[PDB]
From Swiss-Prot, chains A, B, C, D, E, F:
Reaction equation(s) it catalyzes: 4 Fe(2+) + O2 + 4 H(+) = 4 Fe(3+) + 2 H2O
Protein name: Ferritin, mitochondrial
Protein residues bound to Fe cation 1: E24, E59, H62
Lineage start: Eukaryota, Metazoa, Chordata, Craniata, Vertebrata
Disulfide bonds: none
Top enzyme class: oxidoreductase
Subunit structure comment from the entry: Homooligomer of 24 subunits. The functional molecule is roughly spherical and contains a central cavity into which the polymeric mineral iron core is deposited.
Tissue specificity note: Detected in testis and erythroleukemia. Expression is very low or not detectable in brain, colon, heart, kidney, liver, lung, muscle, placental, spleen and small intestine.
Residues reported in the UniProt entry to bind Fe cation 2: E59, E104, Q138
Gene Ontology biological process terms, A to Z: intracellular iron ion homeostasis; iron ion transport; protein maturation
Annotated Ferritin-like diiron domain residues: 7-156
Keywords of this entry: Iron, Iron storage, Metal-binding, Mitochondrion, Oxidoreductase, Transit peptide
Gene Ontology MF annotations: ferric iron binding; ferrous iron binding; ferroxidase activity; iron ion binding
Length: 173, 173, 173, 173, 173, 173
């Protein structure tokens, strides 16, 4: 017996949504890691720290919106371990921005696969949800990180002593 | 000679939109019926009454938005009789909530068929309209009614004397 | 066993009130039809549209007040199909005003029959209700439509090109 | 080496977006032309002028939003000459409204082709962008121009001396 | 070469603090799970949901305060996977409250072990931190959950139909 | 038969004013190009972007004021294609500032030729218009661009990594 709410909601979509929830929580955790890297006494770039912390909290919102969608559609949320980030030392402002950019493109590819699946299962509600709340948000994030990486590289990060310091103060400040 | 406004608007879509307008008006009428059931002297659940009345007025808005779309696209509105509801006595708070839930799923299936037709006729304007204003609204409605049915059942409606009374006061109040 | 509220309320009055509810809902539907006629791209008289839409919503209020009276008196509301309007194309501003005037006189004759019945059944509560909320409202409506028809005719509607256009802007604007 | 931001963005979409940017700029220029036609001493319809000027500025916004999308997605903006409008003398209020209507339908057909291309290239971000910001805007524009053409024709434009004068004052005023 | 900030900070304390960070994040995840259990269509206790969501966000704050302490003292944060909760279906309002109570006592025992370690390593800064921000907070949480479990049991949860419903509305509302 | 408004307005002035309108529109387009260069992901100097966008909108105002003058004097506006800018890639902050400076001097030389023509045709109204609204505006623009080029060169643009970045933030910010 399915949910009395469930309608036109494919089991494969339910499962893909649970995989997406894990990926969003993972991304939250990556950014939380980055945030506290920047507030080390031997790094001390407070606006990089604030930036990544804000990203971490936004990833939690992305996760919750998918958990709500699961409930709305009569799916059942199935949580899995949240894997720790690949690094605990993020090396530099530039390196963390580059890692974030790769992570955002990977999440985007996941969301595009999810939309393709929704399209295959004739679920326009799911397609619209991803278009309204996920796809443009990812385009905006990737473009912003691309901008940041570009500026840091041009400024001489990470080796030029003033580069990360000034970018912290001006762009992220 | 078509409307001088008409563009990429399939006659089958025009007709399906007229069928949808009738269904929305019908749903308005069902809820109007339910609303005045609850204000009978031998039922007297005023917040159930207010709930269904609010649903009835929202269905009229859904109808009007489709009538406006028809005009916008250069279709011609073709009205049909609005059939009376299946019951004039809705038996209980629970039974009316269950009937509303079935009606919302039926309207949803209609809207999903309409989107499939819009998709087949390559009408992305029509697809977007249904996604923006109809499909999520139906998901939200069905989930809300599912919540209400669940609570009423658990509380012992309709036979437990306090159940509908307390649900009227707390959830719908 | 009657309603424990019912007193001095004739079954014939209960039935006539149910017939009146259907007529009010019908009138609502006629005006809704007219409203969306005027917002066609090949008619485009927006203040005619607004006028008829306002009339449509007021007819719904008339219907609801009768549904409430039914409940107040311990009658049982019995809904019937709402028949579609006689036309989907209302031809002109003048023609719609003339159709509205005929409809208002027909509704008035119905209400006068209802009062005669209430009088025959010695129901002064019912007589007063119709006098307070229905009879003067109909006199005012018929007089207003008579005024509008008169002006439109004098102005040269529907064939004189400026007539409906200017009446839309000045009288209904 | 592509943009480090670029993802799931087909070269054909990039090119079609550059063609759309040119068309939007062209439409801006057409309306700018119309605006200054209406403020000639031998035409002097100031509200027609204001109307077309407002349309011209909105077309520039449409162009810029596409230039931003190009950048967001990692495409490269490629500008081309903006061709002058077909006329410098727009003959009458009615004739300009009819020309605008044809132009809006042509732009709409272009945008529908662009959506079909986005659909073929599996770019739901691009599809959504066009649905959110372009397709409904075009439906609304075409319907509004259809309304205006209808009224002007009925009023006797362009030959009836009061028609354009009164429409300027009432509808566009 | 240690942190140039590090003073009187035992490697065993650094490690125990990293274990505590994982436990806090785990507790956040447990409550997030519970929160979305309560907003299922077949559970639909919205104030239970809000309660657990608030608990989840507070656990994140506990985690962050420990990550900040690590940085303050010149320790190095070492993140580990966050294990999924023991259940995805939390059975009832009462059962979730009982699970929360057990979890809070387990976290408390962990914090008491951490204080004993800080005491053994002569780290009064660490002892004070745990006393100021953790130990009383846990006493308050455990007492509150004890109160809630007591009331739910007395009310007849989970089998009495009104119990969880009324507790949701009154105590958690 | 000339405009009934036309007085002391030489056909050569009318033509030169139409050439000036094209040049102003061209300059608008050049700056629009520059603006969207700076918001590329591989350039990302947002205040350069804002600067050039503001210049682009001001050029449109210059064009419109000349179109209004044409109408005021009873001339007839004759629009021509707006040629695309010489580059779509503007290379650097410095290079775009240098290109803008050359463009402003070229527009200035055009306006000085126009004043010489107005002087030759004994049109003091035209001379005054150019003096009031064009000539000082160009002096101010050229001086400002000269200032900017000077600072960028001194700072080490384009090769010194901090130069354009800091000038974007401080001078244009
Ligand atoms: Cl008038
Ligand atoms: Fe995300
Ligand atoms: Fe509906
Ligand atoms: Fe779509
Ligand atoms: Fe009525
Ligand atoms: Fe009387
Ligand atoms: Fe446009
Ligand atoms: Fe905690
Ligand atoms: Fe200029
Ligand atoms: Mg591992
Ligand atoms: Mg029947
Ligand atoms: Mg019939
Ligand atoms: Mg040409
Ligand atoms: Mg495990
Ligand atoms: Mg060329």
């Amino acid at each position: 017996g399915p949910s009395r709410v469930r309608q036109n909601f494919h089991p494969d979509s339910e499962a893909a949504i649970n995989r997406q929830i894990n990926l969003e929580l993972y991304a939250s955790y990556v950014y939380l890691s980055m945030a506290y890297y920047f507030s080390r006494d031997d790094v001390a770039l407070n606006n990089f720290s604030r930036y990544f912390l804000h990203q971490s909290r936004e990833e939690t919102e992305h996760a919750e919106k998918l958990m709500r969608l699961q409930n709305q559609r009569g799916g059942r949320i199935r949580l899995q371990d949240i894997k720790k980030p690949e690094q605990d030392d993020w090396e530099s402002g530039l390196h963390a921005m580059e890692c974030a950019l790769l992570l955002e493109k990977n999440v985007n590819q996941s969301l595009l696969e999810l939309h393709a699946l929704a399209s295959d299962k004739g679920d326009p509600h799911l397609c619209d949800f991803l278009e309204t709340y996920y796809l443009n948000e990812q385009v905006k994030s990737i473009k912003e990180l691309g901008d940041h990486v570009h500026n840091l590289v041009k400024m001489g990060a990470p080796d030029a002593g003033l580069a990360e310091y000034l970018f912290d103060t001006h762009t992220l400040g």
